[PDB]
Structure formats: C-alpha cells, structure tokens
Amino acid sequence: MFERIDYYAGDPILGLVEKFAADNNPDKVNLGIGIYYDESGVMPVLDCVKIAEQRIADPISPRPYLPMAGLPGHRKGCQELLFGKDAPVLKDGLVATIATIGGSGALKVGAEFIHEWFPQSKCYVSDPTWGNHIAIFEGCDIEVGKYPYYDTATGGIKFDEMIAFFETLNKDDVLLLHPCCHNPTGVDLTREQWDTVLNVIQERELIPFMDIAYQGFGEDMDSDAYAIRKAVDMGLPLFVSNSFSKNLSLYGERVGGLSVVCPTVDETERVFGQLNSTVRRIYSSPPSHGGRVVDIVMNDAALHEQWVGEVYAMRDRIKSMRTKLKSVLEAKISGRNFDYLTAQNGMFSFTGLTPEQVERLQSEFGIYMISNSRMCVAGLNSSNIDYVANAMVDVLKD
Amino acid sequence: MFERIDYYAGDPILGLVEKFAADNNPDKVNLGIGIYYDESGVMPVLDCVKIAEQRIADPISPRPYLPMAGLPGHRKGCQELLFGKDAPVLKDGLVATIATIGGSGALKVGAEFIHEWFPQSKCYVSDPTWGNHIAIFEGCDIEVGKYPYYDTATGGIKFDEMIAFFETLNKDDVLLLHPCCHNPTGVDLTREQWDTVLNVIQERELIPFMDIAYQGFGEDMDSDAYAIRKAVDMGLPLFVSNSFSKNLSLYGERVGGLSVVCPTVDETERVFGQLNSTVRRIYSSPPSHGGRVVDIVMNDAALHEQWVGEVYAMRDRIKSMRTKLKSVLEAKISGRNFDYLTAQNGMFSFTGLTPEQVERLQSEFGIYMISNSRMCVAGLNSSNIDYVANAMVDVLKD
Numbered sequence: 001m002f003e004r005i006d007y008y009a010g011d012p013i014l015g016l017v018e019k020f021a022a023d024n025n026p027d028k029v030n031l032g033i034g035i036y037y038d039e040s041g042v043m044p045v046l047d048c049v050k051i052a053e054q055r056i057a058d059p060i061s062p063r064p065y066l067p068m069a070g071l072p073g074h075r076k077g078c079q080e081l082l083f084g085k086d087a088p089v090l091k092d093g094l095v096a097t098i099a100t101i102g103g104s105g106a107l108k109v110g111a112e113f114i115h116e117w118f119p120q121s122k123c124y125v126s127d128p129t130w131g132n133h134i135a136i137f138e139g140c141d142i143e144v145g146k147y148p149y150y151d152t153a154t155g156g157i158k159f160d161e162m163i164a165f166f167e168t169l170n171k172d173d174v175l176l177l178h179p180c181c182h183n184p185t186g187v188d189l190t191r192e193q194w195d196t197v198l199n200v201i202q203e204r205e206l207i208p209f210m211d212i213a214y215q216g217f218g219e220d221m222d223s224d225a226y227a228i229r230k231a232v233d234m235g236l237p238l239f240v241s242n243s244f245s246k247n248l249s250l251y252g253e254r255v256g257g258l259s260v261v262c263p264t265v266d267e268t269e270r271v272f273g274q275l276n277s278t279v280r281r282i283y284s285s286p287p288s289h290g291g292r293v294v295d296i297v298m299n300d301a302a303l304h305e306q307w308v309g310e311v312y313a314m315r316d317r318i319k320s321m322r323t324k325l326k327s328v329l330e331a332k333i334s335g336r337n338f339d340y341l342t343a344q345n346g347m348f349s350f351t352g353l354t355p356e357q358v359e360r361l362q363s364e365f366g367i368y369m370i371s372n373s374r375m376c377v378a379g380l381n382s383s384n385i386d387y388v389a390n391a392m393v394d395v396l397k398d
Numbered sequence: 399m400f401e402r403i404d405y406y407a408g409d410p411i412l413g414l415v416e417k418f419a420a421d422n423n424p425d426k427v428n429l430g431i432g433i434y435y436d437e438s439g440v441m442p443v444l445d446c447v448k449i450a451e452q453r454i455a456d457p458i459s460p461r462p463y464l465p466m467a468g469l470p471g472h473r474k475g476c477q478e479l480l481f482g483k484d485a486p487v488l489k490d491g492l493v494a495t496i497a498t499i500g501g502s503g504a505l506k507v508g509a510e511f512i513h514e515w516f517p518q519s520k521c522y523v524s525d526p527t528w529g530n531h532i533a534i535f536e537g538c539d540i541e542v543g544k545y546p547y548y549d550t551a552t553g554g555i556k557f558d559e560m561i562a563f564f565e566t567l568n569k570d571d572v573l574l575l576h577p578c579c580h581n582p583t584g585v586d587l588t589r590e591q592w593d594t595v596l597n598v599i600q601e602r603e604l605i606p607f608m609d610i611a612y613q614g615f616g617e618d619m620d621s622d623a624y625a626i627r628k629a630v631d632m633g634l635p636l637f638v639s640n641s642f643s644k645n646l647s648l649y650g651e652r653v654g655g656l657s658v659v660c661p662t663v664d665e666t667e668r669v670f671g672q673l674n675s676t677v678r679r680i681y682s683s684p685p686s687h688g689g690r691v692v693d694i695v696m697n698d699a700a701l702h703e704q705w706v707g708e709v710y711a712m713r714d715r716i717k718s719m720r721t722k723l724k725s726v727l728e729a730k731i732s733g734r735n736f737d738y739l740t741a742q743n744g745m746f747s748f749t750g751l752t753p754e755q756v757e758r759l760q761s762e763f764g765i766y767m768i769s770n771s772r773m774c775v776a777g778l779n780s781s782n783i784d785y786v787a788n789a790m791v792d793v794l795k796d
C-alpha cells in the first residue's frame with residue numbers, strides 16, 4: 001500500500017545528536033543544538049515561569065478550547081513586546097495578532113496565508129539560514145530561493161550584493177528576515193543597514209517577514225526589535241513571527257505569535273479573520289497551558305520585569321562565553337582578529353572554522369559543531385570553556 | 399495592500415455562541431456547542447487528569463522539545479486504546495502513530511500526507527458532517543465531496559444509496575468515516591452495516607480514514623472502536639484520527655493522535671518517517687503539557703481505570719438525558735415516535751426540528767441549536783431539561 005512512500009532522512013541536527021550521544025569520549029561537548037543551557041549545562045526553568053505554572057496549578061481549572069487566535073493576553077504580550085507598549089500602531093489597531101504553536105507555527109500560518117492570497121509571491125531566505133524556514137514555506141507550495149547574506153571571505157555581510165539582489169525581486173515577493181541574532185551565523189545588520197534594506201523593501205514593494213526567535217539575546221528587548229519597529233514607522237506591510245521557545249525556556253509548550261501589520265483597521269480585520277480561518281484549517285486552536293504561561297508572565301508587571309532580567313542574564317552569559325572564548329584565542333593566536341566572535345549576536349556563531357577543522361574537533365576532542373562551522377554559544381560554560389577554546393587553538397594552529 | 403483579502407465569516411458554531419451570549423433571556427440555554435458539561439452545566443475537570451497534573455507540577459520540570467511524533471507513552475496510549483491492549487497489529491509493529499494537536503491536527507497531518515503521496519485521491523465526507531472536516535481537507539488542496547448518509551425521511555441512514563455511491567468511486571479515494579457518535583446527527587451504523595461498508599471499501603480498494611472524536615461516548619471504549627478493529631482485522635490500510643478533547647475533557651491542551659495501519663513493518667517505517675517530516679513542516683512538535691497528561695493517564699493502570707470510569711459516567715449521563723427528553727416528548731405528543739432520540743449515540747442529536755422550529759426555540763425560549771436541528775445533549779441537565787423538553791413540545795405543536 002505504502003511502497004510508493006520514500007523514507008524520511010530525519011532532522012539533520014538530530015542526526016548529529018545521535019552521534020554525539022553514542023560518542024564515548026568522556027570530555028565530549030555538544031555545541032550543535034540551538035538550545036540554551038545555563039551555567040551548569042542544563043536547560044533552565046525560569047523563575048517567572050515556575051511562578052506562572054504554580055498559579056496555573058492552583059487551582060487546576062477546566063480546559064475549554066482557547067480562541068483560535070489564542071488568549072488575548074498572549075496576543076497583547078506579543079504585540080507589546082514586539083512593537084513597544086502602547087505603540088501607536090497598536091493604539092491605532094493596525095496589528096492583527098494570533099498565538100501560534102511556537103515560532104514554527106507562526107511561520108506556517110503566515111506562509112499559508114501568503115500562499116493563498118499572494119499565490120505569485122516567492123520567498124527568499126538568507127544564505128545561509130535555519131533549515132526549517134525552507135521546509136515550512138515549501139511545504140506551503142511557495143517557491144523558495146536565497147538572498148546573499150553571509151560573506152565567507154570577511155565573515156561579514158555581502159551588503160552591496162544583498163541590496164542589489166532585492167532590486168531584482170517582484171512586487172509582493174517575500175523576504176525572510178532576522179531582526180537580530182542570526183541563525184546560524186550570529187552576524188547581524190547594523191541599524192544603518194536595516195534602513196537601506198527596508199528602504200529598498202519599500203521601493204520594490206516587497207513583503208518583509210521578520211522571524212525573531214531570540215528577542216532579548218542580542219542587545220536588549222527594544223534594540224532587538226529595531227528592524228520590526230522601523231518597518232512599522234515606514235508603513236511597510238510587515239509579518240512578524242515570534243517565538244518564546246528560547247527566551248521563556250518553554251520549547252515543549254509551543255508558544256509563539258504571528259503578527260501582521262496593516263495599513264488600515266479594516267484591512268486589520270480582514271487579515272485577522274483570515275488568520276483565524278487558516279488556524280481553523282490546520283489545528284483549530286492553540287494549547288492552553290503554554291498560552292496561559294505567556295499570558296501570566298507577559299501581563300503581570302512583576303513577572304514581566306523578572307522575566308526580562310532572566311533573559312538578560314541568559315544573554316549576558318552568552319556574551320561572557322563569547323568574550324572568554326575570544327580572550328583565550330587572541331591571547332594564544334597572534335595576528336588573527338577574533339573580534340567577529342563578540343561582534344556576532346545571539347546563541348549562534350559562525351566560527352570561521354573550515355569543515356575539516358569542525359570534523360577534527362569531533363574526532364580529537366569529542367566537540368560537536370555543524371559542518372558550516374555553526375556553534376551554539378550556550379553549549380559553552382565555565383566547566384567546558386577552557387577545554388573547548390584550547391582545542392580550537394590547536395585545530396587552528398595546525 | 400490587503401483589499402484582496404476577503405472577510406472571514408467566522409466559525410458558524412462560534413457565531414451562534416456569540417448571539418447566545420448577547421441574548422438577555424434569563425432562561426437561555428446553549429445546546430449549540432459540542433462541549434461536554436456535567437450535571438451542574440460546567441465543564442468538568444476529571445479526577446484522573448487532576449492527578450496527572452499534580453504529578454506534572456511536582457516538580458516543575460525543564461521543557462525541552464518533545465519528539466516530532468510526541469511522547470512515546472502518548473503514542474502507545476492512542477494505540478492501545480484504539481486497537482486494544484497489546485493487540486496483534488501492535489505486537490506486529492504495523493501501526494505508525496504520532497501525537498497530534500488534537501483530532502484536528504491529526505486530520506491535518508493525515509490529509510497532507512494523502513495529498514502529497516496520493517495526489518489523485520479525492521475525499522468524501524458524510525452528508526451531513528462536522529464543518530471542519532471539509533475545511534481541513536480542502537485546505538490541503540484535496541477535492542472534497544459528499545457521500546449519502548443521513549436520511550431526512552426516516553431519520554436513519556440511506557444505507558443502500560451510500561453503498562451504491564461507494565461503488566462508483568476510484569481506487570485510493572478517501573472516505574472520512576465516524577466509527578461512532580456521529581456529528582452532527584448522532585446516527586450510527588450498526589455493526590452489520592459496518593461489515594458491509596468495509597467489504598465494499600476492501601473490494602473498491604478505497605482508503606478509509608476513521609475520525610473518532612468521542613471514543614467512550616457511544617456504547618463504551620471497545621464497542622466504539624469496532625469499525626476500527628474490524629478494518630484492521632480485514633487487513634485494510636486504515637488512517638485513524640483520535641481526540642482526547644471530550645473524553646479527557648482536555649479541549650484546550652490539544653491532544654489527539656493519528657494512526658496509520660500498514661500491511662508490513664517496512665511500510666510502517668516509511669509512513670512513520672513521512673509523518674514526522676509532515677509534522678516538521680507544520681508546527682515542529684506537539685505541546686508537552688497535554689502530551690504528559692495523556693502519557694500519565696493512559697499508562698498508569700490506576701489512572702486509566704479511573705479514566706474509563708469517568709467516561710462511563712459521562713456517557714451514562716448523556717444517555718439519561720436522551721431518555722428523559724424522549725419521555726417528556728412522547729408523554730406530551732401523540733402519534734410521533736421519538737425512539738430516534740435514544741437510538742442516536744454520542745454527544746449529538748439531529749432533533750428532527752425544522753429551521754423554523756429551531757429559530758422559534760431561540761426567539762421564544764432563548765434555546766440555541768444549529769439550524770440543521772443539531773443539539774448537544776450534554777448541554778441538557780436536570781436543571782434545564784423540563785424547560786427545554788417542554789419548549790420543544792410547543793414548537794412541534796404549531
């Protein structure tokens with residue numbers, strides 16, 4: 001019956017993970033998975049979350065369906081976070097927002113909405129980018145290409161080429177953009193580059209789709225959202241997928257948001273209604289437990305403030321790891337610039353190591369990265385840092 | 399920018415609900431929504447669930463991604479529930495199962511899988527059926543039509559016409575079937591009619607997709623799954639979507655399962671891999687909280703046994719309401735047979751009332767049903783029964 005069905009290769013990042021677990025090097029370290037670990041190398045449970053969940057468990061309540069858009073408080077928290085509290089765009093009612101099944105789920109609904117209403121649009125992703133972006137869009141029968149982004153030569157951005165690329169695109173074509181904390185490179189646009197980008201986006205009447213999965217891990221909650229807010233100030237029709245997976249340490253509950261910025265309230269209502277309809281077609285409504293956590297933590301002022309602090313500690317710890325890793329490298333290797341390590345933002349780092357060097361890191365030290373050199377900085381901690389930094393010096397010295 | 403966007407009419411079931419809320423009749427009752435309510439007119443929190451959730455909160459754990467297929471325990475609970483404890487088909491490893499975002503999510507994944515690998519297959523739904531079935535399938539770009547089912551004349555099933563219809567269909571065409579507890583009619587097939595249909599499905603080489611959203615609300619857990627188990631016995635390739643929304647009273651947490659019965663272990667693996675790949679491109683993985691609940695409740699023998707007991711009481715209560723409703727009607731309306739009310743199974747009932755009568759039921763009494771005459775029996779309880787039964791008497795006499 002199902003002889004025609006091909007085997008599924010399996011998630012690539014998961015394929016590596018099997019190999020690491022198998023590895024019997026006592027000193028093995030996994031830096032391959034984009035998961036945040038704390039000082040002790042474990043996934044944290046955030047204090048604010050813990051508190052939110054005790055409230056949810058006290059008392060244990062009936063579990064009616066959430067609305068299709070999810071909880072209003074969840075929606076508002078997304079909005080206030082992304083566009084700023086009582087931002088003009090929100091007080092004008094020009095943002096249609098739904099809770100989603102994580103950032104993935106927001107990408108799916110947004111892509112499906114684009115596919116239905118802008119059937120001609122293509123989508124373009126950064127070269128390189130997070131593998132799942134491509135699957136989600138193509139899974140909607142939207143054609144996906146790549147725009148120039150990362151400059152292998154410099155470690156920077158092929159900014160000129162990227163800009164020239166965008167001018168070739170068709171009206172209503174979609175750009176998948178990372179407002180900060182690029183996955184996998186860590187290399188972000190400066191504000192001035194954002195203004196040029198958004199300028200051409202405006203001129204070419206392209207659709208910007210900002211995926212922000214690490215708000216708070218780059219500069220701060222506001223800064224990380226500059227690209228979003230500047231697109232709003234310019235009056236662009238912006239799609240924003242956001243995820244709480246990382247910054248809430250709530251990967252498994254599937255919490256995120258999708259927001260569509262619209263030129264008029266009436267368009268806001270058309271789009272909101274169609275987002276609902278799209279949700280109804282896929283999974284009907286989002287999960288109550290994850291949504292309640294988001295609702296409680298975003299809208300309780302004491303919990304929100306605690307939560308930002310918790311995110312900033314996670315960001316600060318990742319920044320310390322970057323600094324420490326650079327300090328060892330620059331102390332030990334003269335005449336190579338390692339500023340790109342602290343210039344990069346978020347959880348990810350393109351190390352600049354060649355595939356052969358990544359592989360030698362695996363064999364010789366049991367240290368696991370992606371072949372494109374991507375390292376998750378949160379994998380690093382006080383207990384493994386000197387071992388990893390020193391292994392890296394060795395591989396680069398050969 | 400979004401003037402091309404059509405307004406979404408809104409979920410009809412949800413649309414009626416708003417009119418009810420707005421309604422200022424002191425004695426209003428809502429029988430429009432397929433939600434289960436206890437004797438007091440409130441959504442229950444089941445004891446087993448409450449226990450499962452105390453275990454989940456003690457202690458509050460890290461929240462990593464579940465696997466794409468969800469928790470193994472959740473997958474095994476679906477399987478055992480659907481096909482019977484340690485069934486041959488399970489011991490033979492011929493069932494590919496994933497957790498899903500409710501029954502809706504399972505429908506979506508199985509419809510996407512069908513669309514990808516059997517692009518020619520069309521899907522046929524019962525006339526009438528639950529509104530979302532169509533949207534889910536059409537949302538996958540699968541063409542959907544209807545098979546004869548409900549007989550307006552007799553209140554039964556146009557069984558002969560249905561069977562003739564199935565014989566016209568192409569090989570690999572999909573039938574969406576309700577093992578029990580038909581929505582919206584309440585009218586089910588007998589076991590003998592099941593044997594006939596599944597025979598024709600076998601001879602016409604059609605694909606049965608069984609959606610069972612109310613296991614436990616018909617006769618009992620095992621009886622309700624007859625159509626499923628008989629299809630397995632016959633060696634048919636079967637798709638089953640199951641939902642814990644009602645029978646676990648866990649609508650909000652989005653818990654259900656998709657199961658694909660395969661002729662051989664190797665095909666089981668192919669299908670299992672692609673199900674995962676399909677999950678990846680939609681929402682990446684399912685929610686932990688809901689999945690943990692299902693895991694704990696299905697796999698703890700004391701909780702499972704308690705849980706069956708809880709569903710039994712819910713079913714018995716619905717059955718009592720059917721009997722009391724019929725008794726009032728037959729006592730007060732001469733020469734109309736109302737055995738169809740007790741003959742129907744599950745939460746829903748096609749009351750036989752015309753759209754005019756349904757609408758008069760709204761205007762005169764604030765009693766809300768679907769225009770097609772669908773009533774949710776769980777909406778009825780000892781506090782509202784007489785009032786609803788007696789109002790129904792008056793609409794029928796005019």
Ligand SMILES: Cc1ncc(COP(=O)(O)O)c(C=O)c1O
Pocket residue numbers: 283284432499500501502503528581609610611640641642643649653654
């Ligand atoms: C017959 C039927 N199938 C599928 C579903 C999907 O619901 P859920 O996603 O909550 O399991 C429902 C209920 O909403 C239903 O009544």
Ligand SMILES: O=C(O)[C@@H](O)Cc1ccc(O)cc1
Pocket residue numbers: 011013032033034035130132183463466682683
């Ligand atoms: O960026 C990453 O490494 C994550 O995307 C890893 C991942 C991907 C899929 C998944 O089901 C679990 C983890």
Ligand SMILES: O=C(O)[C@@H](O)Cc1ccc(O)cc1
Pocket residue numbers: 065066067068284285409411412430431432433528581
């Ligand atoms: O069968 C019914 O009437 C409803 O239970 C379906 C439903 C449930 C929740 C929802 O957000 C939309 C439709």
Ligand SMILES: [Mg+2]
Pocket residue numbers: 139140141537538539
């Ligand atoms: Mg499609």
Ligand SMILES: [Mg+2]
Pocket residue numbers: none
């Ligand atoms: Mg110019």
